Design a protein around this ligand. Structure first.
Ligand SMILES: CCCCCCCC/C=C\CCCCCCCC(=O)OC[C@H](COP(=O)(O)OCC[N+](C)(C)C)OC(=O)CCCCCCC/C=C\CCCCCCCC
Ligand SMILES: CCCCCCCC/C=C\CCCCCCCC(=O)OC[C@H](COP(=O)(O)OCC[N+](C)(C)C)OC(=O)CCCCCCC/C=C\CCCCCCCC
Ligand SMILES: CCCCCCCC/C=C\CCCCCCCC(=O)OC[C@H](COP(=O)(O)OCC[N+](C)(C)C)OC(=O)CCCCCCC/C=C\CCCCCCCC
Ligand SMILES: CCCCCCCC/C=C\CCCCCCCC(=O)OC[C@H](COP(=O)(O)OCC[N+](C)(C)C)OC(=O)CCCCCCC/C=C\CCCCCCCC
Ligand SMILES: CCCCCCCC/C=C\CCCCCCCC(=O)OC[C@H](COP(=O)(O)OCC[N+](C)(C)C)OC(=O)CCCCCCC/C=C\CCCCCCCC
Ligand SMILES: CCCCCCCC/C=C\CCCCCCCC(=O)OC[C@H](COP(=O)(O)OCC[N+](C)(C)C)OC(=O)CCCCCCC/C=C\CCCCCCCC
Ligand SMILES: CC(C)CCC[C@@H](C)[C@H]1CC[C@H]2[C@@H]3CC=C4C[C@@H](OC(=O)CCC(=O)O)CC[C@]4(C)[C@H]3CC[C@]12C
Ligand SMILES: CC(C)CCC[C@@H](C)[C@H]1CC[C@H]2[C@@H]3CC=C4C[C@@H](OC(=O)CCC(=O)O)CC[C@]4(C)[C@H]3CC[C@]12C
Ligand SMILES: CC(C)CCC[C@@H](C)[C@H]1CC[C@H]2[C@@H]3CC=C4C[C@@H](OC(=O)CCC(=O)O)CC[C@]4(C)[C@H]3CC[C@]12C
Ligand SMILES: CC(C)CCC[C@@H](C)[C@H]1CC[C@H]2[C@@H]3CC=C4C[C@@H](OC(=O)CCC(=O)O)CC[C@]4(C)[C@H]3CC[C@]12C
Ligand SMILES: CC(C)CCC[C@@H](C)[C@H]1CC[C@H]2[C@@H]3CC=C4C[C@@H](OC(=O)CCC(=O)O)CC[C@]4(C)[C@H]3CC[C@]12C
Ligand SMILES: CC(C)CCC[C@@H](C)[C@H]1CC[C@H]2[C@@H]3CC=C4C[C@@H](O)CC[C@]4(C)[C@H]3CC[C@]12C
Ligand SMILES: CC(C)CCC[C@@H](C)[C@H]1CC[C@H]2[C@@H]3CC=C4C[C@@H](O)CC[C@]4(C)[C@H]3CC[C@]12C
Ligand SMILES: [Ca+2]
Ligand SMILES: [Ca+2]
Ligand SMILES: [Ca+2]
Ligand SMILES: [Ca+2]
Ligand SMILES: [Ca+2]
Lengths: 148, 644, 612
């Protein structure tokens, strides 16, 4: 939705992915039904019908990725980050997946001395790991800068 | 080197021709008042050129002047055509410049003037080279897809672009999106460009046509190391069979990954390319499970049978060198009687006893083994290459050379035995240290010995080679210094330095501290000697041999996750080699076939896994729909200080 | 290996049988219109099977089709029963699938159709194996408790589940919650499942019944390394006596932790298990103070008395090997007179002087000491095991072997002395280097020497073993190369390489740079020699011996907090060993008893602390 940077699309792409558990680009009422039951909720069949039909511009009946990207730019929370942090993250992230890893904080720390054990690398991860996948986001990376 | 000198002279000359022309300078800034005064004249040179062979419309499009460019199109509509005629920017039209500058009004104005959407920017400044900072393509659709403008791509298709535009490299539009430095936004365009295909029957859909190297867009992401594009192209090639709670069972398609491959398949492309970013595709979702099922099942047992045949081969060669024929010395000791100790020599008619008939069997095992090496290795060197890319396959490297040099030195010994030449000690004593140190090849199939044999190689071509240039500086200076000190004295009470070849071999050993050091304690040594040897032992033993341990110790923890990535790529290179050379009676093809399961003729590999259940993530995106610690936090401040 | 090949062929065959059946394919997608057309026919095969032996209701529950599943229950109510009859998913009913998919409407619809809540999913795809990705249990209550659905657990109890359902492993519901990978949400379910017990008199409450290994839910958290579940189960076993400002005095219960333990107690379970995550329970709140009170009071003095008895034992054995009997050479030197230097030999009737009567006392101290070793160590090897799990107790490891091999080599020397055999040098010279290097066992009770003896062990089975495979490659190549160079020459001016066993022993020493290097400087050495020895000394001394120091130096700072966790577990293994073998007259039982304080018959340990 052409206001979104490189790291947000990479966050929203896998965010689209764990909804879509059949390996395509279509959110039917089924897959959003499988999510909302796993949240412990009882999904109303009208509620499942409304939430798909509310954001579906093409009218096919399945939410694809550009419509999930359009919806998420509406319901974006906010971010007001810095130039120095964003340029730091794009150099730190090497393959460009939008994520710094445990394999990619070893490279940054070896770049400035700083002998870490592989345990202490993962001990750095879990402090910045707000949600949890064993990876630090861009939103979590900003959080570990402007804390002071 | 002189081309960049010539290219800089072109850009300064272009700025000269603009200032020395009243049309081009007025089209440069904006000067909409000045164009109406010039273009109303009779001969106002509308087809004027420059250093890049550009017109006034190329200038107005390059410096982003919408107002001046429309005046040029009104007074002369022929300038929408007629691209640049220089060698550098050959073929680049004015539509190309408006697209790269990502202008929306100037592109739509040019398309109303019947611009060519199928022109080719086939200059030397658009080709894929390390000299150029960009590789955008040749066509306007290729330019709009790489600067990430979805408005102009949709605009160019509606005015009749070609979705299958191929370059001089043969690359389509989808190949160029992979070669771009912004991986995430290339994925967004890749879905868009396939969406407008949708009628590409052609007996070739869209993303299956290769370039002039035979690479599809799927395999080009494999070679160039686009980890982001590789995971995006996996969405088409998997099928979720069933989801049983926190347990899914996907079904990957091994039709472009598995090296059954009469064509060139993806495991050969990754393992032979020189990039260090392509070896990260060996950890992805179908490829990591494919290699392990080849290596555990059929890769490791066949590699440990070749490790045991070769080990019994190099024992059979060793006992032919121990029991080799010798006779006592024939004529005399009379070579000058103070420096000769050899007392046996080589025999001519060796095979005349029953104990040598056993050895003749053992030598024919060796020589036949030396021919078989030169028939399975040399017809890959002279055939697949003219030795241009044989050196570093992955980093595996020397074991091609050590097995050729072994098979050469056995056959030199065959020649010297048949013609009964004198010195067979020289071709043998190479052939043993080349022979047994090639057993280190078979230490890549064991995790204990695997990553250690890589660190031996990364020191010899590195932290040991740069030490042996500054060792040969030192032991040429001191060995020529110690030689002239003991040159004027007695060479039997201390004879470490009597010849200059011997003085080089003493000081090589005194640098290594493997022999003791010249001391007699009965006769007065030269007074200059004790000064120049105490100078020597400080910068040999106290300084420079304690600076290898400080340098190899510094390197060993820096490349300590690279050598683990190098070992997992040595298994893939071994597995593909064992799969290719062995027959099809052994080594069954990987994955389950699909003939008797209603899936076609291709080959599948299913992987099931337990993923998670992460509540805090899934609850945050769900509402959006609606109608040990102490020294870790010390490390982040160390990163905040480094970032600042 | 071929089982996973066979299991993949089962899943592809199941997708074949669905597509090749009009009922199963229609039940797969949703096709509620298509079911009414088929099921109104006469013989529409309601008990149709597949590859997993599933029905149409198993398919509709697996792909989460509530609408199609109710149509199957209306047209055929018998399909709520009749579980899968394959070997892999044996016994799994349709209620099991609706619970694991965490469907709320399909479960409640099945319970109205009188579903079996006490069925058993006793297939080979639900058993606790490394092949399976899940271990959920066998019962529907076990399935709902592991996918974290408190709605379905409350729903299953109201329809008559069994709270004491045991598997084929014997595990109850509370045992399965410990084996789950999400520790925090397992604690939330553990309080819920005990809350609905509340009438479990039974002479066994709920969380005291063991599985088929004798482990309670408290001790199973101790073995499996659930640090989160272990701290949650400590809430039941403590009592806060008084709170005086910033100072509380709790009272832990040592009835399932302390190794008085005629049963198998928790300090033996942790110290013998192979997991490296169970050794983190040795730092928790009752266990860290329990070990220190055993080790400081009665553990260290009894370990330093055994360190002084053994040290005076191995001095008494050493002086029997120094003063051992020898007589001068009997017959002749006439073995070939250029290579013989031995000039004494062993005596037969040694004990005929008063100075040897002292040694006979010293040898009977040794041999009796060698029997006592084989009576306190061998009846634990042949009895508690058939040598299946003797090797790595914790990582302690070789000192079992070095004390058996010592007691064997003393008794070989006893046999050779009685039958008057020839070579007693060979059984002795093993028995001394085995004997004195076993004093390194007693360096685990000293913090100065403790963590250093572990790093000696983690190099020998590691960074020294992988170097000695690539050392024997090199000194077979060069020693066979140096041998053939000096094979044609004079073996007395430079005789480092005259035999092939001697050429292997020279090049082993030239690799280590412990002997100097072949150089004569009076006679012309072979021209090939100076080339092949300069090649040798670079890749022996300059490359590979400086690559041990770079490799042992890289390892020593990586495992530098693991060897400190290994040392604190070597004290616990020593303490439990000293507690077991010593009698009860020594070593008083830890903690304060509760008979004369009105607390029962169990044993308590109070810990006070200042918190914050
Ligand atoms: C001599 C003639 C006869 C020798 C061997 C007979 C045939 C051996 C091969 C048979 C195939 C079966 C096999 O798999 O056998 C190879 C084993 C593998 O090792 P593993 O048991 O640890 O695999 C498990 C690793 N886990 C536990 C970490 C997961 O290894 C072995 O037996 C080693 C077999 C010999 C390999 C020597 C090659 C030269 C190496 C030089 C190194 C420098
Ligand atoms: C597929 C590739 C292999 C093919 C088959 C292998 C070769 C067999 C075929 C032909 C034999 C030729 C090889 C030997 C060439 C010279 C033969 C020779 O000259 O005689 C062989 C000697 C017998 O001695 P002798 O005849 O000279 O008379 C006695 C001498 N006197 C009096 C001093 C004691 O045999 C000895 O010495 C044996 C002592 C060597 C030590 C053991 C050998 C192997 C070691 C380990 C094997 C397993 C390790 C793990 C793998
Ligand atoms: C992988 C990284 C390392 C690789 C690079 C290492 C390069 C260095 C290695 C070898 C250097 C070759 C030196 C060979 C010299 C032997 C020449 C020879 O065979 O004859 C020896 C002669 C005299 O000896 P004599 O006792 O028979 O006469 C006694 C005098 N009378 C007759 C009056 C009694 O002495 C002479 O020629 C003296 C000639 C002096 C020239 C020596 C320097 C040559 C090479 C320089 C390149 C190094 C640059 C980087 C370091
Ligand atoms: C019949 C003979 C036995 C009778 C007496 C001999 C002494 C053994 C009993 C004396 C009490 C031992 C003891 O309680 O202390 C052992 C002392 C180390 O002093 P500490 O532990 O008290 O440190 C202070 C720690 N704080 C401040 C926390 C208290 O050392 C020692 O006597 C150790 C005695 C010899 C140990 C043999 C081990 C062999 C060495 C192997 C190295 C490889
Ligand atoms: C815990 C259970 C195990 C120990 C139980 C005790 C049982 C002891 C029984 C036998 C000990 C085995 C020794 C076998 C060979 C002994 C040597 C021998 O059979 O010949 C005796 C010699 C010469 O005796 P003599 O000519 O003076 O006449 C003797 C007249 N009479 C004794 C009245 C003075 O005496 C000599 O042992 C030579 C002098 C030795 C040099 C110092 C050795 C000790 C040094 C350090 C050990 C303690 C360090 C602790 C830290
Ligand atoms: C736990 C981790 C440990 C890591 C280390 C691995 C263990 C292996 C290490 C070292 C190898 C030990 C085997 C020793 C070889 C026995 C040879 C021997 O002692 O027999 C003596 C014979 C001849 O002796 P002579 O001087 O009287 O005849 C002179 C000839 N005349 C009579 C004509 C004058 O020599 C012969 O035949 C030589 C026969 C060829 C032997 C080469 C291969 C032997 C070993 C192969 C396995 C290595 C695998 C590495 C990975
Ligand atoms: C006469 C009788 C005893 C049979 C003896 C046959 C084997 C002892 C030889 C014959 C051909 C040899 C093979 C020829 C070619 C290769 C490929 C070669 O590949 C590399 O060097 C890859 C690493 C790199 O890139 O350097 C490794 C050794 C190997 C497997 C050789 C292993 C030993 C083999 C099987
Ligand atoms: C940076 C260095 C100085 C480290 C400090 C070590 C010193 C204590 C060493 C290094 C140089 C040595 C000197 C080097 C040269 C000589 C001359 C040497 O010659 C003689 O007077 C005797 C003749 C002979 O030895 O042949 C005697 C030892 C001596 C004084 C050495 C004595 C010990 C010295 C001063
Ligand atoms: C005539 C007299 C002097 C007899 C000699 C008695 C002692 C010198 C011997 C007899 C029994 C021995 C003990 C038998 C068993 C053990 C356990 C043993 O433990 C292990 O093997 C280590 C455990 C692991 O592998 O981690 C260490 C030696 C020790 C204490 C021995 C120490 C020396 C002892 C006390
Ligand atoms: C112990 C492991 C982990 C290290 C690697 C093994 C080899 C690299 C070393 C260690 C043991 C050594 C062997 C130990 C015993 C002997 C017997 C001995 O042979 C003799 O009898 C000749 C010498 C003599 O008689 O004095 C010396 C060579 C040899 C084969 C040694 C050769 C080098 C070996 C094989
Ligand atoms: C990896 C290396 C090249 C780093 C630098 C070390 C060199 C300076 C060394 C390594 C090999 C050495 C050579 C190995 C073999 C010989 C033969 C030998 O000469 C003889 O024939 C004997 C002496 C005599 O003639 O009396 C000793 C000198 C020489 C040239 C050595 C001279 C010093 C060399 C070139
Ligand atoms: C001059 C003659 C006598 C012997 C010379 C020995 C040299 C040429 C040989 C013997 C030992 C060999 C090395 C042994 C080990 C390794 C590590 C491996 O990962 C790559 C090959 C490499 C790096 C070899 C390169 C070539 C080598 C250095
Ligand atoms: C061949 C004969 C003569 C020599 C016998 C040497 C062997 C049996 C002995 C000598 C020294 C011993 C080692 C000494 C130190 C340690 C570290 C310790 O934490 C575990 C045992 C361990 C790893 C021992 C293992 C066995 C050992 C290697
Ligand atoms: Ca879907
Ligand atoms: Ca849509
Ligand atoms: Ca990354
Ligand atoms: Ca994260
Ligand atoms: Ca020395």
């Amino acid at each position: 939705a052409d206001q979104l940077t490189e790291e947000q699309i990479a966050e929203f792409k896998e965010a689209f992915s764990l909804f879509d558990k059949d390996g395509d680009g279509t959110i039917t009422t089924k897959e959003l039904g499988t999510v909302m039951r796993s949240l412990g909720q009882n999904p109303t069949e009208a509620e499942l019908q409304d939430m798909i039909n509310e954001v579906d511009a093409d009218g096919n009946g399945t939410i694809d990725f550009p419509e999930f990207l359009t919806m998420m730019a509406r319901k974006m929370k906010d971010t007001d980050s810095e130039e120095e942090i964003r340029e730091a993250f794009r150099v730190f992230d090497k393959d460009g997946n939008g994520y710094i890893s445990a394999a990619e904080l070893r490279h940054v720390m070896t770049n400035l001395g700083e002998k870490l054990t592989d345990e202490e690398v993962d001990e750095m991860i879990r402090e910045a790991d707000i949600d949890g996948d064993g990876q630090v986001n861009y939103e979590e990376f900003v959080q570990m800068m402007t804390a002071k | 080197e002189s081309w960049a000198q010539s290219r800089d002279e072109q850009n300064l000359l272009q700025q000269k021709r603009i200032w020395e022309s009243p049309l081009l300078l007025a089209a440069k800034d904006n000067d909409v008042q000045a164009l109406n005064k010039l273009l109303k004249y009779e001969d106002c040179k509308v087809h004027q050129r420059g250093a890049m062979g550009e017109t006034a419309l190329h200038i107005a499009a390059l410096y982003d002047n919408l107002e001046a460019a429309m005046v040029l199109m009104e007074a002369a509509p022929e300038l929408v055509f007629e691209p640049m005629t220089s060698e550098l920017y050959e073929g680049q039209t004015a539509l190309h410049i408006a697209v790269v500058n990502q202008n929306m009004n100037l592109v739509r104005a040019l398309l109303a003037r019947r611009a060519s959407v199928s022109a080719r920017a086939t200059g030397t400044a658009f080709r894929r080279s390390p000299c150029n900072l960009i590789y955008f393509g040749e066509h306007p659709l290729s330019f709009a897809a790489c600067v990430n403008s979805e408005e102009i791509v949709r605009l160019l298709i509606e005015h009749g672009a070609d979705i299958r535009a191929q370059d001089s490299l043969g690359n389509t539009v989808l190949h160029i999106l992979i070669l771009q430095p912004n991986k995430t936004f290339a994925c967004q365009m890749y879905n868009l460009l396939l969406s407008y295909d949708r009628h590409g029957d052609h007996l070739q859909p869209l993303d299956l046509v290769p370039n002039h190297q035979g690479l599809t867009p799927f395999k080009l992401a494999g070679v160039e190391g686009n980890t982001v594009m590789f995971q995006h192209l996996m969405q088409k090639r998997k099928h979720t069979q069933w989801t049983y709670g926190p347990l899914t069972s996907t079904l990957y398609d091994l039709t472009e990954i598995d090296s059954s491959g009469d064509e060139q398949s993806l495991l050969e492309l990754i393992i032979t390319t020189k990039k260090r970013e392509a070896r990260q595709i060996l950890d992805q979702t179908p490829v990591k499970e494919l290699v392990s099922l080849k290596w555990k099942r059929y890769g490791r047992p066949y590699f440990c049978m070749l490790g045991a045949i070769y080990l019994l081969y190099i024992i059979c060669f060793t006992m032919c060198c121990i029991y080799r024929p010798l006779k006592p010395r024939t004529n005399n000791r009379t070579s000058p009687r103070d420096n000769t100790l050899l007392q046996q020599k080589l025999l001519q008619e060796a095979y005349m006893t029953p104990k040598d008939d056993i050895r003749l069997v053992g030598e024919l095992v060796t020589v036949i083994g030396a021919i078989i090496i030169l028939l399975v290795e040399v017809p890959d060197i002279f055939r697949m290459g003219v030795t241009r890319f044989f050196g570093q396959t992955i980093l595996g490297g020397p074991f091609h050379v050590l097995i050729i040099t072994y098979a050469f030195m056995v056959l030199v010994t065959m020649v010297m035995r048949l013609i009964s030449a004198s010195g067979e000690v020289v071709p043998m004593s190479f052939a043993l240290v080349l022979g047994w140190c090639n057993v280190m090849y078979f230490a890549r199939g064991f995790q204990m010995l695997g990553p250690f044999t890589i660190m031996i190689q990364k020191m010899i071509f590195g932290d040991l080679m740069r030490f042996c240039w500054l060792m040969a500086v030192v032991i040429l200076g001191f060995a020529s210094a110690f030689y002239i000190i003991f040159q004027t004295e007695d060479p039997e009470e201390l004879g470490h330095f009597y010849d200059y070849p011997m003085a080089l071999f003493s000081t090589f050993e005194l640098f290594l501290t493997i022999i003791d050091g010249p001391a007699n304690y009965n006769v007065d040594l030269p007074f200059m000697y004790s000064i120049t040897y105490a100078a020597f032992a400080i910068i040999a033993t106290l300084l420079m041999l304690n600076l290898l341990i400080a340098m190899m110790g510094d390197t060993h923890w820096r490349v300590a996750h690279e050598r683990d990535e190098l070992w997992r790529a040595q298994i893939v290179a071994t597995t593909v080699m064992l799969e290719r050379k062995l027959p099809r009676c052994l080594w069954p093809r990987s994955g389950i076939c699909g003939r008797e399961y209603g899936l076609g003729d291709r080959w599948f590999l299913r992987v099931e896994d337990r993923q998670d259940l992460n509540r805090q993530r899934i609850q945050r995106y769900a509402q959006a729909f609606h109608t040990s610690t102490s020294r870790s936090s010390a490390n982040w401040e160390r990163l905040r200080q480094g970032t600042l």
